[PDB]
From Swiss-Prot, chain A:
UniProt cross-references to CDD domains, sorted A to Z: EFh
Domain of life of the native organism: Eukaryota
Species: Homo sapiens (Human)
Activity regulation remarks: (Microbial infection) Inactivated by S.flexneri OspC1 and OspC3 proteins, which specifically bind the apo-form of calmodulin, thereby preventing calcium-binding and activity.
Protein's recorded name: Calmodulin-1
PTM sites of type Phosphoserine: S81, S101
Protein's UniProt keywords contain Nucleus: no
PTM annotation (Phosphothreonine): residues: T44, T110
Cellular compartments annotated: Cytoplasm, Cytoskeleton, Spindle; Cytoplasm, Cytoskeleton, Spindle pole; Cytoplasm, Cytoskeleton, Microtubule organizing center, Centrosome; Cell projection, Cilium, Flagellum
Binding site for Ca(2+) 3: D93, D95, N97, Y99, E104
Gene name, Swiss-Prot/TrEMBL: CALM1
Subunit structure comment from the entry: Homotetramer. Interacts with MYO1C, MYO5A and RRAD. Interacts with MYO10. Interacts with CEP97, CCP110, TTN/titin and SRY. Interacts with USP6; the interaction is calcium dependent. Interacts with CDK5RAP2. Interacts with SCN5A. Interacts with RYR1. Interacts with FCHO1. Interacts with MIP in a 1:2 stoichiometry; the interaction with the cytoplasmic domains from two MIP subunits promotes MIP water channel closure. Interacts with ORAI1; this may play a role in the regulation of ORAI1-mediated calcium transport. Interacts with IQCF1. Interacts with SYT7. (Microbial infection) Interacts with Rubella virus protease/methyltransferase p150.
UniProtKB/Swiss-Prot annotation, chain B:
PTM note: In absence of Ca(2+)-calmodulin, AMPK also phosphorylates Thr-5, resulting in inhibition of activity.
Gene (UniProt): NOS3
Family designation: Belongs to the NOS family.
Full-protein interval shown: 491 to 512 of 1203
Name of the protein in question: Nitric oxide synthase 3
Sequence segments annotated as region (Calmodulin-binding): 1-20
Species whose genome carries this gene: Homo sapiens
Tissue-level expression: Platelets, placenta, liver and kidney.
């Protein structure tokens, strides 16, 4: 209700510090989209008006960080619990073949920020890979979301 | 890290369609 997983801890710190330069406690509204996009996220302006509409319910002109991911937790938790996983293929699965290959995770990484060669990927996959085909499936990419 | 790598990358990008609208 108040906190989720380290997922919040990973970006609620940056979504806070990426734009809290004014020293206004939390990050600005007109800039929240950018604190959101500076994270690699590509949201809508209309939803940016939907969230600014939801947060500006107090009238402070700023955006709390521990309570916004919670908004993201509810944007996925109640909508579809089945598609919530398959969307990760929307995240990593590039070749749309069902298997997020080592080039795609690399191409993921490149999109996300890192470049990863052929021999450096044979660790990102093996980490989730059960059979070791070199192309991460659902259950490998999935178990690693629970494995720990 | 050698045996754990997606576990680290997932925390950053585990969900995208949650805040995405197309």
């Amino acid at each position: 209700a108040d906190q989720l997983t380290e997922e919040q801890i990973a970006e609620f710190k940056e979504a806070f510090s990426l734009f809290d330069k004014d020293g206004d406690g939390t990050i600005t509204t007109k800039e929240l989209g950018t604190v959101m996009r500076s994270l690699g996220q590509n949201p809508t302006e209309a939803e940016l008006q939907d969230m600014i509409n939801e947060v500006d319910a107090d009238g402070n002109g700023t955006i709390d960080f521990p309570e916004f991911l919670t908004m993201m937790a509810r944007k996925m938790k109640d909508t579809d619990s089945e598609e919530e996983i398959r969307e990760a293929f929307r995240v990593f699965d590039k070749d749309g073949n069902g298997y997020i290959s080592a080039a795609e995770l690399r191409h993921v990484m490149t999109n996300l920020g890192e470049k990863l060669t052929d021999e450096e990927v044979d660790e990102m996959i093996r980490e989730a890979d059960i059979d070791g085909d070199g192309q991460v499936n659902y259950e490998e990419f999935v178990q690693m979301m629970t494995a720990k | 890290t050698r045996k754990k790598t997606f576990k680290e990358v997932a925390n950053a990008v585990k969900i995208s369609a949650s805040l995405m609208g197309t």
